[PDB]
From Swiss-Prot:
It is linked to Agammaglobulinemia 7, autosomal recessive: A primary immunodeficiency characterized by profoundly low or absent serum antibodies and low or absent circulating B-cells due to an early block of B-cell development. Affected individuals develop severe infections in the first years of life. SHORT syndrome: A rare, multisystem disease characterized by short stature, anomalies of the anterior chamber of the eye, characteristic facial features such as triangular facies, lack of facial fat, and hypoplastic nasal alae with overhanging columella, partial lipodystrophy, hernias, hyperextensibility, and delayed dentition. The clinical phenotype can include insulin resistance, nephrocalcinosis, and hearing deficits. Developmental milestones and cognition are normal. Heterodimer of a regulatory subunit PIK3R1 and a p110 catalytic subunit (PIK3CA, PIK3CB or PIK3CD). Interacts (via SH2 domains) with CCDC88A/GIV (tyrosine-phosphorylated form); the interaction enables recruitment of PIK3R1 to the EGFR receptor, enhancing PI3K activity and cell migration. Interacts (via SH2 domain) with CSF1R (tyrosine phosphorylated). Interacts with PIK3R2; the interaction is dissociated in an insulin-dependent manner. The SH3 domain mediates the binding to CBLB, and to HIV-1 Nef. Residues 1-77 form the SH3 domain. It comes from the Eukaryota. It comes from Homo sapiens. The gene is PIK3R1. Belongs to the PI3K p85 subunit family. This is Phosphatidylinositol 3-kinase regulatory subunit alpha.
Amino acid sequence: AEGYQYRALYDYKKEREEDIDLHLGDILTVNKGSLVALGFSDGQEARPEEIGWLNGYNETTGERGDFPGTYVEYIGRKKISPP
């Protein structure tokens, strides 16, 4: 399984409770399935600003939730592996 990774370029304080805080440098991983379900074919994952809101796992803080695509940069794919 593989996810798409993004890095936070700006700080963000959650508005809604399903949002997550972003801190400069935080690494986020979004499961491909969630993007596929939104019809995000082609390669829009490399343009999160264009996507709008993403839902993922903040690798740096351990929190899961929604975060704005205009606040991050796509850094590439990551293969998820079992523990």
